[PDB]
């Protein structure tokens, strides 16, 4: 592996370590359910409610909060009923995305090839890759056997459908975590994957297209090379292309997500000022 590639990984790895708290020990003062939008009878053009329900039900999770003392507080969300009930966990998730976003921005800011870029293009990359970077980080704490995101004191475990697994993987977001987990990537791979997602020229708002596309290509080669050096090449020949395809799906999940969020925000403003500034 070449010395400039080695130098990039070293940097990217340091940014992860400096900006990703795998323990979530500093995620505090978050809202909890039973601790927001008024139900509809009226309506005719909602309709809009049925679509939001159809996007949200597939991503139903239960919250488990372990206490220092040893106690375990556990929330089981309501079944769909009519409305409102479906959003009980979204104000907590807003605070969860906000914690995650601070760390993502911090990640980018640490990397040299990010500060060097112009402000107008810095703004464009973080506005477009924040969701993706955060989803990659979430996958690192994901347990595919139990369907849980282990976030230190917090734990978010997907609800049964049966339905699923047939219904479960029909939702792109979950097929992603499950398929990405299967790959069993190194810390080096997840962070390179994070770099390639960050420095994406295709993103709306990017003025200096050439300057960014050359960086994406660099990390992409750095990734492809790493696999050719640190993994037994016969079986792990097709891994680079698999990872690259996952990032294409991650870009399309991001699209699907921005769309789902606008429909959610149309019913009630759940998004925090930081979430707003990024979306």
């Amino acid at each position: 592996l070449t010395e400039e590639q080695r130098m990039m990984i070293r940097e990217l790895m340091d940014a992860q370590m400096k900006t990703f708290d795998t323990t979530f020990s500093h995620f505090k003062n978050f809202r909890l359910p039973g601790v927001e939008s008024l139900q509809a009878p009226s309506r005719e053009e909602a309709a809009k409610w049925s679509q939001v329900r159809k996007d949200l039900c597939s991503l139903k999770v239960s919250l488990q909060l372990r206490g220092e003392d040893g106690s375990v507080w556990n929330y089981k969300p309501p079944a769909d009923s009519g409305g409102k009930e479906i959003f009980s966990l979204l104000p907590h998730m807003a605070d969860m995305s906000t914690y995650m976003f601070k760390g993502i921005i911090s990640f980018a800011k640490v990397i040299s090839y990010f500060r060097d870029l112009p402000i107008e293009d810095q703004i464009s990359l973080l506005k477009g890759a924040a969701f993706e970077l955060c989803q990659l980080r979430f996958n690192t704490v994901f347990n595919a056997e139990t369907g849980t995101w282990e976030c230190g004191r917090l734990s978010y475990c997907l609800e049964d459908t049966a339905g699923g697994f047939q219904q479960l993987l029909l939702e792109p977001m979950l097929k992603f975590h499950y398929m990405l987990k299967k790959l069993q990537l190194h810390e080096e791979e997840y962070v390179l994957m994070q770099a390639i997602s960050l420095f994406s020229p295709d993103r709306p708002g990017v003025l200096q297209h050439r300057v960014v596309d050359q960086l994406q290509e660099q990390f992409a080669i750095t990734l492809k090379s790493y696999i050719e050096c640190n993994r037994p090449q016969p079986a792990h020949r097709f891994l680079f292309l698999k990872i690259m395809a996952m990032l294409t799906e991650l870009r399309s999940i991001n699209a699907q997500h921005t769309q789902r969020l606008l429909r959610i925000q149309d019913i009630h403003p759940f998004a925090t000022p930081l979430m707003q500034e990024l979306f």
């Binding site: 911090s106 640490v110 703004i123 930081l274």
Partner: protein, 91 residues
């Protein structure tokens, strides 16, 4: 150098701050507000480093409040200096 109130109703406020000096340094801006005398539990929210304007809503009519902006650095160099900028308004 200073934080100002661009426009205000007795319920809402528009705030503006001029953008250091820094960044590289700063990931996000922690913006705080609460009625200046102690009792109420202090409210806070963050905005990205690139923002010069923010909104503070749900305020009470004619009521002395305190606003503060904290700059948060990415891990490694400031600019080891900070101070938080402050102002007081009564709607």
């Amino acid at each position: 150098a200073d934080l100002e109130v661009v426009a205000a109703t007795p319920t809402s406020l528009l705030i503006s701050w001029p953008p250091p000096y820094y960044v590289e340094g700063v990931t996000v801006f922690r913006i705080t507000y609460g009625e200046t005398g102690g009792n109420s539990p202090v409210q806070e929210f963050t905005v990205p480093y690139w923002t010069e304007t923010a909104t503070i809503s749900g305020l009470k009519p004619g009521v002395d409040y305190t606003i503060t902006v904290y700059a948060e650095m990415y891990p490694g160099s400031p600019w080891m200096d900070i101070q938080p900028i402050s102002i007081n308004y009564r709607t």
